[PDB]
Amino acid sequence: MKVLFLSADGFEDLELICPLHRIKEEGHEVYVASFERGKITGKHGYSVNVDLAFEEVGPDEFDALVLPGGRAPEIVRLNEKAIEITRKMFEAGKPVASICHGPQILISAGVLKGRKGTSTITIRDDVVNAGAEWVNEEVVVDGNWVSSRHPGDLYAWMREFVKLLK
Amino acid sequence: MKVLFLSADGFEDLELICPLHRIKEEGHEVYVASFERGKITGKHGYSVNVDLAFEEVGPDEFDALVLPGGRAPEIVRLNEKAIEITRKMFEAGKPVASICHGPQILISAGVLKGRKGTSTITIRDDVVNAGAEWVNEEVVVDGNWVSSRHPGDLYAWMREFVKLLK
């Protein structure tokens, strides 16, 4: 599969980089999209190469989607193409993994009504106002949506998400 | 398996944390050992809890060993118990994974003569002086010793190491 990651400066470093490696380890291809090609820098200073700008990504081009956290989702959610990609992939049933603030992008995509998941508790009320049930668990699997809260959940997040990537 | 990680302050954050989560994802138990219980802080500022002091670890207690990099190997290698643990486990044929500066601990354990592996190139000459053949590869498998160089190698390093945990 081809797995797309949406991020930007201020990403939570472990939440982007550890899944990039975990998913490539399985033999999938991984791609990072952001506002522009170049590099993006995480909260803790690691640099990651951006393969594609959002405008270059087709809403049907990739097979699965990963939404890391940090401060990046708060700006990614403003890009209309990023949220269009997210909406189309989520509504099509493609595997979508989110952690921490990642669901801000799903909120802006308008896809959470009647869904169930988790996030950092600091945006619980926003997830609930987007129409989802929020629960406090290390990982939630709601159909195609696999969600976790914070970096300490990474092992459980990827344990469940990699099952959807087969 | 119970998998032991030896580290200390100044560890390369991704080289400790991503494998901790990868191995826990498999359902294995993971343990971080260092000079003392408490927290250790990486070069990039992530904090990891130390489960055991080196003195609490039996040289035969764990099933596999991980030696992350950063500045931590340079101090771990001074601790007699850490070196004794590493020597016993490595000589017993138990899976040992190293990355970056990790092999400084193996050098000090006296176990590298006639072995083959990689590391950060900045310690190639010391690996050679310890009696090993040094090669520049994203991952090397020499019997029980799985070695890599830098964080960019994580996916390949773990792909090969997890095979030995099966």
Side-chain angles (χ1 to χ4, degrees):
Chain A
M1 309 177 64
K2 297 206 280 290
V3 181
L4 178 67
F5 290 66
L6 307 182
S7 193
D9 283 335
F11 63 91
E12 182 57 59
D13 309 52
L14 304 166
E15 296 173 1
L16 174 56
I17 295 168
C18 296
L20 280 168
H21 283 283
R22 176 69 191 93
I23 292 170
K24 191 173 182 39
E25 167 185 353
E26 279 308 87
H28 306 305
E29 294 178 339
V30 301
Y31 302 80
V32 175
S34 193
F35 292 95
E36 58 185 21
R37 286 163 171 248
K39 64 170 192 174
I40 51 173
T41 303
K43 288 173 73 255
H44 290 257
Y46 284 107
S47 268
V48 172
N49 291 331
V50 176
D51 301 299
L52 298 162
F54 299 130
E55 290 58 34
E56 308 178 58
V57 178
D60 280 8
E61 183 177 357
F62 294 89
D63 300 299
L65 185 63
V66 182
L67 304 177
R71 294 187 276 278
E74 253 176 39
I75 54 174
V76 172
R77 76 193 299 192
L78 302 178
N79 179 278
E80 292 198 351
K81 179 69 173 209
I83 61 176
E84 177 184 339
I85 293 161
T86 297
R87 180 174 180 83
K88 201 178 184 195
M89 296 181 72
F90 191 96
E91 288 182 339
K94 296 179 173 179
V96 175
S98 66
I99 189 159
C100 187
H101 285 85
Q104 293 177 315
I105 297 159
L106 295 169
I107 290 170
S108 296
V111 295
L112 291 184
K113 294 193 175 186
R115 304 300 295 254
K116 179 177 185 180
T118 194
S119 66
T120 176
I121 192 161
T122 64
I123 70 171
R124 162 191 62 201
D125 295 346
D126 305 324
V127 173
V128 169
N129 282 340
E133 178 185 358
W134 189 92
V135 298
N136 177 38
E137 304 285 3
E138 66 180 1
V139 64
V140 182
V141 177
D142 177 32
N144 59 320
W145 180 25
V146 180
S147 61
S148 291
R149 306 167 297 190
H150 44 239
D153 301 328
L154 273 163
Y155 72 101
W157 189 42
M158 285 296 102
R159 182 188 70 231
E160 297 306 321
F161 190 63
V162 300
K163 293 175 184 169
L164 283 186
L165 306 177
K166 305 179 205 159
Chain B
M1 271 194 170
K2 310 176 194 299
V3 181
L4 181 63
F5 292 69
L6 305 184
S7 192
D9 280 333
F11 61 90
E12 208 293 331
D13 307 54
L14 302 165
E15 293 173 5
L16 173 57
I17 295 164
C18 298
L20 270 176
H21 284 278
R22 174 67 186 95
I23 294 166
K24 189 55 178 312
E25 171 179 352
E26 292 188 85
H28 301 130
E29 307 157 42
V30 298
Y31 305 75
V32 176
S34 192
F35 294 98
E36 56 177 11
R37 284 159 169 258
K39 296 185 153 200
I40 50 173
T41 299
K43 295 172 68 174
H44 287 256
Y46 284 107
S47 183
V48 168
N49 291 310
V50 175
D51 299 305
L52 301 168
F54 297 129
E55 291 74 26
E56 296 176 82
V57 173
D60 304 330
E61 176 173 8
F62 292 89
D63 305 307
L65 185 64
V66 181
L67 302 173
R71 309 307 172 193
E74 259 176 38
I75 53 176
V76 174
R77 75 189 302 190
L78 306 173
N79 181 274
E80 293 179 4
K81 181 68 178 301
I83 291 319
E84 284 169 359
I85 293 156
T86 297
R87 179 172 180 90
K88 190 70 170 170
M89 294 180 74
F90 189 96
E91 284 184 348
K94 292 178 177 182
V96 180
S98 66
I99 188 161
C100 177
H101 285 85
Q104 292 176 316
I105 297 163
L106 293 173
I107 289 171
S108 296
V111 296
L112 290 183
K113 192 172 335 209
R115 301 305 294 245
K116 180 187 186 170
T118 193
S119 67
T120 175
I121 194 167
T122 64
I123 69 168
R124 165 195 58 204
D125 294 346
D126 305 322
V127 171
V128 171
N129 285 341
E133 177 185 353
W134 188 92
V135 294
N136 192 7
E137 303 287 2
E138 68 174 351
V139 64
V140 179
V141 178
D142 170 38
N144 63 314
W145 180 25
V146 178
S147 63
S148 287
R149 309 161 302 182
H150 40 249
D153 299 331
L154 273 162
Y155 71 99
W157 186 45
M158 285 293 105
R159 186 187 70 235
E160 300 301 323
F161 187 60
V162 157
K163 293 186 193 180
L164 293 180
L165 304 183
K166 291 185 292 77

